[PDB]
Design a protein around this ligand. Structure first.
Ligand SMILES: Cc1cc2nc3c(=O)[nH]c(=O)nc-3n(C[C@H](O)[C@H](O)[C@H](O)COP(=O)(O)OP(=O)(O)OC[C@H]3O[C@@H](n4cnc5c(N)ncnc54)[C@H](O)[C@@H]3O)c2cc1C
Ligand SMILES: Cc1cccc(C(=O)Nc2ccc(NC(=O)c3ccc([N+](=O)[O-])o3)cc2)c1
Lengths: 273, 273
């Protein structure tokens, strides 16, 4: 159990179900003796774009600009934009991280996809040496909590919207696990434009119950980077003895590591593997 | 063949490979007698956030705000924000649509993920009746062209980054096909931070070759919405006779329609199915 957390609301409104879920998250963690940092994004009319004005001091190369390179430099010295630096020390503090938001266009709203870019800078958040489960934030846990337009049958394995494990891999593995996070199961509060008034409290209640023993959960299964060739000459492929083990096995490992086989369904939604 | 197009650069720089790819796209289409609209996003320091100030006139409900509902209303009358309306008539004009950008955090940069939200409004872009291949933009074609941090072996089926078909479903199906677009194959220009100076011309050349007979291509396979239960009582599931046809078949249909089976690999990258 850890003494700290971070919540990130990503909806304009303070009337929304997302706000209520955040205030429900707040009151829940506050009730267990956790510190609850809040990066209410829309409230702090946050910057979502990457111009060259993230870096404070002189540009090392102001002719052609690799933002990748010029950002990494700016961190280690200590002259980035301090609205990035402010948000960074919350993460160094916070053991848990909760992202509350709506699914609009099969992904996270624009204002969080700018948060991810500007804050998660190389060395700080990710390295191309310290990757995935070896990554900086490996001693942390992270959770998603989404508010969907369609129903839960639409995003089934055979709904028109297709699988939901598929829409969570880009995020839960590609961002959170890539930095280090032991990604816990997400909270899929579907079709909220239909739900009754009382069932928009049952959801808010089941959330608070869940948040009690949240650190003591077991996270989702991602093929650990102990199973891979971490050098860029072989091609960063999966280790060659482990390839033969899975050719007698029926499923994949993750969604992205389907291996052209069965997807162990609810890989990104349930944890028991 | 159509007499129009639209390109959307989503990188700050005009030195970038993305800019060169856009200028290469521009000169290519201009050479074939196509009109080339350009929404150079960073140049038009574009708005990526959704506040309530997209709608011009009075808010129908300024107590609790569904942006979904208040946006749809605002379109059909004709008093949205005109920087949205300006971008919209380009789409009504443009037959083809090219998205040039970098893959940062397993997806599209923040400034395009705001473009998608504010411009693709209900009735205009998508409907919950006219869905997918029946959708508004069904008489149009759309393409992606990406610039990646890692190499092409990393995003193989057994690389640490996992599949690339998996990272393209959220976008190519969940955005473009959902509106209508017959999504043509994407342009995966990998690891550009390593590439030699001359091979950063071979790529720019092969692009221009490809753009000549681009409309005469055959698009990617997405399970058409003729195969689905388009009413929200059964649950928007796949039609019940078609379910039995695929239980004797070995592969899935799409990535999201894996059906817990093999993924017909390069579903989102090659077209022959
Ligand atoms: C916060 C952050 C997170 C990231 N996360 C990931 C991740 O999770 N996974 C991942 O794989 N990558 C990641 N990346 C890396 C990202 O993919 C790279 O930024 C991008 O792929 C590299 O292209 P670029 O547009 O940034 O570079 P460019 O600015 O396009 O550099 C390309 C070079 O080609 C030159 N060039 C070639 N031809 C021409 C021409 N005709 N005219 C002019 N110049 C030319 C340019 O001058 C330049 O030097 C991340 C980057 C950042 C900043
Ligand atoms: C009752 C109430 C009040 C205020 C606020 C709220 C709320 O959070 N609404 C809400 C409900 C749903 C979404 N997501 C979508 O609408 C949506 C758009 C496009 C897609 N898509 O194509 O997958 O899904 C966003 C906000 C609900």
């Amino acid at each position: 159990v850890g003494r700290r957390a971070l919540i990130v609301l990503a909806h304009s409104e303070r009337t929304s179900f997302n706000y209520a879920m955040k205030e429900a998250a707040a009151a829940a963690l506050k009730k267990k003796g956790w510190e609850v940092v809040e990066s209410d994004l829309y409230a702090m009319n946050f910057n979502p774009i990457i111009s060259r004005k993230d870096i404070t001091g002189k540009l090392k190369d102001p002719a052609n600009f690799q933002y990748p390179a010029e950002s990494v430099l700016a961190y280690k010295e200590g002259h980035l934009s301090p609205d990035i630096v402010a948000e960074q020390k919350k993460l160094e503090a916070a053991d848990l991280v909760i992202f509350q938001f709506p699914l609009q266009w099969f992904g996270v709203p624009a204002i969080l996809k700018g948060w991810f870019e500007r804050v998660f800078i190389g060395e700080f958040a990710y390295t191309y040496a310290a990757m995935y489960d070896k990554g900086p934030f490996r001693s942390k846990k992270a959770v998603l909590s989404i508010t969907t337009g369609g129903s839960g049958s639409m995003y089934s394995l055979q709904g028109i919207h297709g699988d939901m494990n598929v829409i969570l891999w880009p995020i839960q593995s590609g961002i959170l696990h890539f930095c280090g996070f032991q990604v816990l199961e997400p909270q899929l509060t579907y079709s909220i434009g239909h739900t009754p008034a009382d069932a928009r409290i049952q959801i808010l209640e089941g959330w608070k119950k869940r948040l009690e023993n949240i650190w003591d959960e077991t996270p989702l299964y991602f093929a650990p980077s102990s199973l891979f060739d971490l050098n860029f000459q072989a091609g960063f492929l999966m280790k060659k003895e482990v390839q033969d083990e899975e050719k007698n096995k029926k499923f994949g490992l993750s969604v992205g590591h389907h291996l052209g086989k069965s997807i162990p369904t609810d890989n990104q939604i349930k944890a028991r593997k």
